[PDB]
């Protein structure tokens, strides 16, 4: 029976491959060769945010695009004011190891995680004026990698136990568990319609889940190594993933197919974080080789390098209004690029 | 414009207070020395940690010679470690507790050590090698049932090193076996690494009163070498 199961699984896999081939027609690069090239983009550093003691893994820009949060292995959840370079808050974490940071759209809640398997949620607007743990979410098993806020009451969190769980801060329960991955899921991104999201695991797969029904609508594959960076396109029908094999892809949700590979021969270091701009021509991707790259999403051509960092760039975040981008590396420095 | 002025002054005062608190924490963060324990599944990590506590992550705090150390023992995680091992780059030393009596998992332990030594974020960290379960190794070698040569074919063409320092109550066969394991680890240690990180072999048992001093000497030598390379003294 197992042999028959494997045979029919292969049959369905090659049927899906045949469907993809039938929906190929032509490549995007061939039909988009008439676009005027953007050319060199010279982005300088505006303000350097230096108040951290250890490496930085996670940051998230605010909805107001004025203030941002940062992570550090010392145990700090500092909230910075990018315009003035003023630290408005400094949250001492119970567990020194944090890898995820989320800023609620309401502006009152800030999330954190780490190896403690706890998605602690901190509230800001309090009568006493001091930050505190709003809720201590527990139930995961693996290392906590990326958490994001659906709203003031629900968050989607990815852990190292190959599952993504949607929580309810008010009641502290796992409403739905998305159990479809083989390896460690690391990065997840939220669509602008806040009903679908894509998650990237260490099995070179990207899965588009349905928030309400709690099932995997479709899966995307085509990378060679583990993917740890993912981000929705602003329109909501595309998303880019950055693997460890020095390649950046762009899968479209509707067609279930790869569009381009953003890679070069001279690049041998893996991608860490990716973040689209507010238009689409700008696809920013972090890198291990002490710098950042700025790709063009419609021509797969390099345009501009955000060099000026030491160690590994471990995060990447573009403001909602697109005015600037922040790249934090392991040297405990956050740099604002205009 | 008064509202903007007082808001700016309040932000400046809050920033100053945050700077003061961060400096006070900075006086503490560098004082502690971070440590990490790695090894096989049945390696004596928690045993050593619990034994020297008297003197997910299972932390421990202890101070010797007026400086304190922090040891990290992750046990609430899975067995895939290629993603959460990057978090421990800024760690003073890595303690590699290894099984020495069960030779079946010795190959897995050597592969684990090879992955750590050649890792492209852990190539700076010095590794402390704890050959745990020495008493059980002595009991097993003296029994003779295990046939250590079966698991390692090239053990037969091996003799004790000239610089061996056996304890007075030991046996040539057991000291040969333990130094064989030590050299099997060191050949992987020596094969790569251009002086950036150093491996120190140490024969330790779980219930040992001098386990802290071994870590002290290892960390002192590692930091001394790092400082010498940092200075012009190389």
């Amino acid at each position: 029976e197992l042999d028959q199961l494997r045979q029919e699984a292969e049959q369905l896999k090659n049927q899906i491959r045949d469907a993809r081939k039938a929906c190929a027609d032509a490549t995007l690069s061939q039909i988009t060769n008439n676009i005027d090239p953007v050319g060199r983009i010279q982005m300088r550093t505006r303000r350097t945010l230096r108040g951290h003691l250890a490496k930085i893994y996670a940051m998230h820009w605010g909805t107001d695009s004025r203030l941002l949060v940062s992570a550090s292995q010392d145990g700090k959840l500092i909230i910075w004011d990018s315009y003035t370079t003023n630290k408005v808050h400094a949250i001492p974490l119970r567990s020194s190891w944090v890898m995820t940071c989320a800023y609620a759209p309401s502006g009152n809640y800030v999330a954190c995680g780490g190896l403690d398997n706890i998605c602690s949620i901190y509230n800001l607007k309090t009568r006493e004026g001091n930050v505190r743990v709003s809720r201590e979410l527990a139930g995961h098993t693996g290392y906590l990698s990326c958490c994001r806020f659906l709203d003031d009451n629900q968050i989607v969190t990815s852990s190292g136990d190959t599952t993504c769980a949607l929580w309810d801060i008010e009641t502290g329960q796992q409403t739905t568990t998305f159990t479809g991955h083989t390896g460690d899921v690391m990065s997840l991104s939220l669509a602008p319609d806040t009903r679908l999201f894509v998650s990237g695991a260490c099995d070179a797969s990207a899965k588009l889940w349905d928030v309400r029904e709690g099932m995997c609508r479709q899966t995307f594959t085509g990378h060679e190594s583990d993917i740890n960076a993912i981000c929705f396109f602003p329109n909501g029908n595309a998303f880019a993933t950055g693997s460890d094999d020095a390649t950046c892809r762009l899968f479209d949700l509707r067609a279930d197919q790869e569009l381009m590979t953003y890679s070069h021969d001279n690049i041998i270091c893996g991608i860490t974080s990716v973040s689209f701009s507010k238009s689409g021509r700008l696809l920013l991707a972090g890198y291990d080789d002490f710098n950042c790259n700025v790709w063009d999403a419609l021509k797969a051509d390099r345009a501009g390098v955000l060099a000026g960092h030491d160690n590994r760039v471990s995060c990447l975040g573009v403001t909602d209004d697109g005015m600037a981008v922040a790249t934090g590396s392991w040297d405990s420095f956050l740099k604002i690029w205009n | 414009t008064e509202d903007q002025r007082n808001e700016e002054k309040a932000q400046r005062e809050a920033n100053k207070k945050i700077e003061k608190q961060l400096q006070k924490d900075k006086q503490v963060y560098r004082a502690t020395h971070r440590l990490l324990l790695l090894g096989a599944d049945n390696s004596g990590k928690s045993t050593i940690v619990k034994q020297m506590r008297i003197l997910g992550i299972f932390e421990t705090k202890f101070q010797v010679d007026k400086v304190n150390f922090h040891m990290f023992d992750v046990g609430g995680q899975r067995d895939e470690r290629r993603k959460w091992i990057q978090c421990f780059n800024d760690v003073t030393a890595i303690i590699f507790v290894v099984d020495s009596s069960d030779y079946n998992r010795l190959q897995e332990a050597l592969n684990l050590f090879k992955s750590i030594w050649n890792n492209r974020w852990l190539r700076t960290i010095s590794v402390i090698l704890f050959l745990n379960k020495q008493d059980l190794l002595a009991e097993k070698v003296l029994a003779g049932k295990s046939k250590i040569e079966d698991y390692f074919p090239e053990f037969a063409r091996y003799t004790t090193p000239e610089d061996a320092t056996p304890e007075p109550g030991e046996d040539p066969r057991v000291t040969r076996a333990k130094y064989f394991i030590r050299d099997e680890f060191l050949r992987i240690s020596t094969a790569s690494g251009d002086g950036r990180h150093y491996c120190y072999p140490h024969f330790t048992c779980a219930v040992d009163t001098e386990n802290a001093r071994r870590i002290f000497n290892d960390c002192k030598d590692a930091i001394l070498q790092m400082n010498l390379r940092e200075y012009n003294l190389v």
Partner: nanobody
Amino acid sequence: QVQLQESGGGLVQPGGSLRLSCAASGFTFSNYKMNWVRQAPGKGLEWVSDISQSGASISYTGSVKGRFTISRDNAKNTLYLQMNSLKPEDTAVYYCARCPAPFTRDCFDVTSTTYAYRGQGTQVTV
């Protein structure tokens, strides 16, 4: 997708020769370092042998030293383990595992949990 299919493997009495062929697709064969892993009945996973990108950095496990012969054909994207002088202890399942990160000499691919980058394995019985 990355697919690792193993070929060969039958019931052979002690002695004889078996040629296990690994079929690799969906990735660049040359860049990645590969290895073989066993799964004996009633026991856990173990590591057999590994070869680097070029193939001149071959290493073997303690259990077998001269009884196996691992080599790669980067042109045809194949990995082989020429085995001879078999023993009854080698009644395991052989998976053609691959280290995740390209252009590196470290990989953690002996995990008991379902490692992504390895095939179902072929049964060899002695």
